[PDB]
Amino acid sequence: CRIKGDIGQSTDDDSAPLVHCVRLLSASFLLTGGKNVLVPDRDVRVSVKALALSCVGAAVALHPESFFSKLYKVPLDTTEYPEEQYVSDILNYIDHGDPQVRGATAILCGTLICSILSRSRFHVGDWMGTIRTLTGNTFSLADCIPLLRKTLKDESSVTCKLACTAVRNCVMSLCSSSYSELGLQLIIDVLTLRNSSYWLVRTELLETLAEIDFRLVSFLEAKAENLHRGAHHYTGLLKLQERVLNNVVIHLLGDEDPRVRHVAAASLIRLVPKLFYKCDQGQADPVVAVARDQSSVYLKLLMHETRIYRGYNLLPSITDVTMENNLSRVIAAVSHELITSTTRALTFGCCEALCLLSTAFPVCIWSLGWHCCTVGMATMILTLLSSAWFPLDLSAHQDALILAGNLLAASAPKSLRSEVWPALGDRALVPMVEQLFSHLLKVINICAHVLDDVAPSLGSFYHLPSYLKLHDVLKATHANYKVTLDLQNSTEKFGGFLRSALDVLSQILELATLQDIGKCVEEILGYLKSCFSREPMMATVCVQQLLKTLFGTNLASQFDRPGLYHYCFMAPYTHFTQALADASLHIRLFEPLVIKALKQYTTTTCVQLQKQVLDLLAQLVQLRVNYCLLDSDQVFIGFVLKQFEYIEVGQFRESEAIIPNIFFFLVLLSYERYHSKQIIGIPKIIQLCDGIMASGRKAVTHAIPALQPIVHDLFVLRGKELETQKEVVVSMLLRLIQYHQVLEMFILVLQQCHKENEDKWKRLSRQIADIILPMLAKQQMHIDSHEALGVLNTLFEILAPSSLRPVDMLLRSMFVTPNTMASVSTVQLWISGILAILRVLISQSTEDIVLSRIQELSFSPYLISCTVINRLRDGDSTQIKNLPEETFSRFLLQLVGILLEDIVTKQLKVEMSEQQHTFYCQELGTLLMCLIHIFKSGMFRRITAAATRLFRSDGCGGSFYTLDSLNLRARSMITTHPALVLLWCQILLLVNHTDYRWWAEVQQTPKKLGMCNREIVRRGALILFCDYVCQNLHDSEHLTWLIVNHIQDLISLSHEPPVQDFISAVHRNSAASGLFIQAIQSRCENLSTPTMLKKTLQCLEGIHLSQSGAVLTLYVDRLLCTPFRVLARMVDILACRRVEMLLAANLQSSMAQLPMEEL
């Protein structure tokens, strides 16, 4: 517990403070000055040692360099301590006595692995190389893996739980790195933890496996040869996804501990997107599956654009084929456990998993996933509701009620018409709907008796013993609730059950009509009166559905081959190009139950109930119910107004959840007249809105939601006094014009103004353009998100093109420079403003117009030079006949340099957030997409010529980002953002930069499973290079280089469209075909797999006729004799065709192809 030397100081300059902090509490509590000398627990208790080890791990998380430092800065006496000691010696506490210290050491190793990989950008070869030169530490990152492995097999359950947590942190990082085989090994090791008596270990394992991306794992399994054998020479396959899904995630749904069951169900939902199955339409092999996920975010191109219940979806849905297959496979597995369920736990767990799955992936949306529209499995779930033991479990009973309602509601579109239940028109489902509807009325009747504590006709249950048992269970739970005060307890079994019963009944009420309910409508209103006090929200929601059914407003009464090239480049580019192209173009019964909602609104503080009473009130007005009959003395409308005083001064606990409904209710109430007296006028509602924005409340949650029901009323459906209010609202919208939500409001206003007064549409568009564009220059627009920028992009299209035709204002705002680039938020706002304007220039104007106006407004290429960039990054705010294309191309190339530099050299948590990291890559993706379109469409020839020349040229005295500088920043993004690297690869081709320094490296050209991201680039780059050669057949070097160095990858990737054309081009050329045959002969051994050999023959089939004598030689020498008879037959057929087309040609030509000795 004594510092026997110098560790440095906290206020030191040569090294970060965390380096000293790790040194300070490692020498103080964990290490002496000697090698492998644990501090005895007498001096410092194991409680401190465990607490100190967690401090090191948390510190090492933010700074992995601190872990490798020498314990003492100044080497102490070399006689008493012959060998200096490193901080990395604290890992010897993996063999301590108490379990807590052992577990903390395991977590430290797990944290250390995750940080080192996340800090090296998976380049640990270089990061550990420099750290071992700077500090001299010989520690290897592959040493914590054995520590984690043996800590999982620990006697103590406490240590094993902490060891699992350590794996959870570092398992995904290990898989996505050069140590993938170790990451795969950890997944294998943790699988045995399902057989643990400690529930915490079981729940921890479920959460650990929920983090696994099985598309990545399937890639690792596919190329793992020795790891399939395991330690005992196994002869099969690992099948990790099958084991994890079935033997762990589904299996633990049958656990006797409800907490373990709940975690398994949650982990099941998370795994569904990340599963991978072979022979899928969306993705063929795991590499494409991985590339889909990464390209779906960075390359997410950005654009913009009587209430059915929760579980209904009428309009067709563009559902992903891939995870519909994943959803169906999982749902099948859960249901197979439900039929073959011998235990109550498995039945309870599986029913809960399906209920949660129907919420995460709605059955109405994913009907093809829920076993085809569909009803999925409703007879099974309704069978359990008719059982004698399943209903008695309130937790599982309500899980079945919600699931059963979802499945029946999922068939609504295809199972309606326009007896009993006339609207269904699919009489197979009538018994199912009738059973559930009767069952729901019974359980609600039971709850009605329980609240009314009266001892026990459609909902009658007094003669059914199975429901009498349920009533006893519900009576007990309420009796327990009646003598406790735990108002903030959400998981109250009785309250949750009544809510679920009223929830599903409200859902089923959609499919019903007046005919089959008017008889039983009075008994349900009786049930809700007793159930209102306990559950006022859902009791009011059920009232709304009854009105929607009684008035015929519900749904029933109102009815009438993709590979890397496609996903990485072609599909996003085509959408981007297309978007650019389009740019240029019985009621009296409800009154007792409705006054209670009004009476409770003025007394409750539950905004969820309060915003529902207004929703009910809005619906009542929409049904032309006389409002004066409800508000006999204007009390409620007076009370609602009085709520604004507390709302605008911040004295309302949650006003953001009630403001949208208050204003929507008020604007609807302005039409109603109290016998030639208006209840409230639009001018007062406008004045109420302006008070909200005038106060200090955030406009994003109080003023913007207030405006939406007003602009969607005045400007969508509504002239002496109307016009001036519209301008006042427009003026108020102008104040909040910096918020992207208001931009959506202006998009709606402009579109409607485009049809009433086109001249006014011109003026408003000019007014908006002259306002936002200056603020885009000064970064005053809140466009620092993908959603925000997309709204701004579409707003420009809606604007009158006359407002943007003089591009002087656009170029003035685009060619600007931010206040500083030391702040990530400012950099994003600056670039986001540029990309919004850049899209306009290349879509609403021509190259000639843009380049012409650049001359008059003398923008310099040095607007953002390397000097200006570096000066700005420190917060310091303070020629020749240069063609405009140079200035325009230099501006975009410098922006690429800025984004590349601070995507690969900016900390993921210290200097920038996680959303900020994604938007950084999204900004780069849309910028590289813009560059590709500019260099590929051919509509910008001078810019392409300038950029092609500027890429070739060096930096002007180091004042500009040279190409080598950009490549270095891009070459290091291969392991992290392969999607963006492929876009950069595409640009390098569009500027004819085809030097093999960059290309032979990304393709891993031949002069430990590896990273998946490295493979996405390696395959993606090869595809793009072949596409480039397909446009440059005259170039005879990039064609011969590809064949002699990448023929195996050409054959493997032959199913890709660009590769298909390249092989076809090779076939047309006689010289290319000769090289194609020769390369295959030199690499025939790798072309031995039946899958790869078949692809070899498919390529080798339509080869050039002049090479027939050469390919025939290869057939009967190295391909005819295979164990696989189908391929030998294929070789025989192709070999026969070559001979039959050789004797059917000119004799001397055939003589040349086959010499006599060869024949």
Partner: protein, 279 residues
Amino acid sequence: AEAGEQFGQLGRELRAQECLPYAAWCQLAVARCQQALFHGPGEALALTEAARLFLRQERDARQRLVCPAAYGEPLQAAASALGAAVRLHLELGQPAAAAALCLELAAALRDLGQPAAAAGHFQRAAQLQLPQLPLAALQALGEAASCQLLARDYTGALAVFTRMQRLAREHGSPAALGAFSDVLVRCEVSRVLLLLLLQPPPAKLLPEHAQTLEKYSSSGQLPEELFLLLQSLVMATHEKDTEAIKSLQVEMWPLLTAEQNHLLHLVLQETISPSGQGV
């Protein structure tokens, strides 16, 4: 009423002391009391519990402690109780519950070493489930086919596999819906192996089997490597090149389940050493 609860706590106490034959007898007694009370769900639950207790008796007498003196005596009582429960369920509807009970009985029989009766009960459960839960019926038929392969009823297994393929194609569609795609893949591989084993003549060669054999002389939903290996296997068995089937059997071992590995081994064995010769 009260007698039923008395018999229930009697059975609970008897199961507490693990004299579970008498616990099952008390469950039968409470089922009779429910009959007197005309309570179908409660009687079905009581019969299910009695059958489960009898099945546990037989499992202990045959699996936990393998008693040669056991002659499947509580298995008869379990089957009788389960049949009564299934009959009650069907008479009150709920064919899914009866199919579940039949699946339970079939699983018990399969574990106890009676694949034929297990396959029969699995087929009965699938027939009970088919009009309403086609995927559950397909799973039950798959269990039936596995049991029939256990009982060496290769032609019955082929018929069940063909029926499952037809049902999956006509219910899970054109491309399958994933949950039916794996069923179709299993059907295809198992049917191909069984047709190479049995080698039906043109008289027995149904149009479906002929079409499937034509497909292997492109890949619907099988992985390309597995499809190519199956095509090579079909060509080798049509060519009688025993070395080819040996090499394939080595190659397709990791890509097949244990059931399909057994089927491929049977194909190879009947290739080298045909059965029926008497030597």
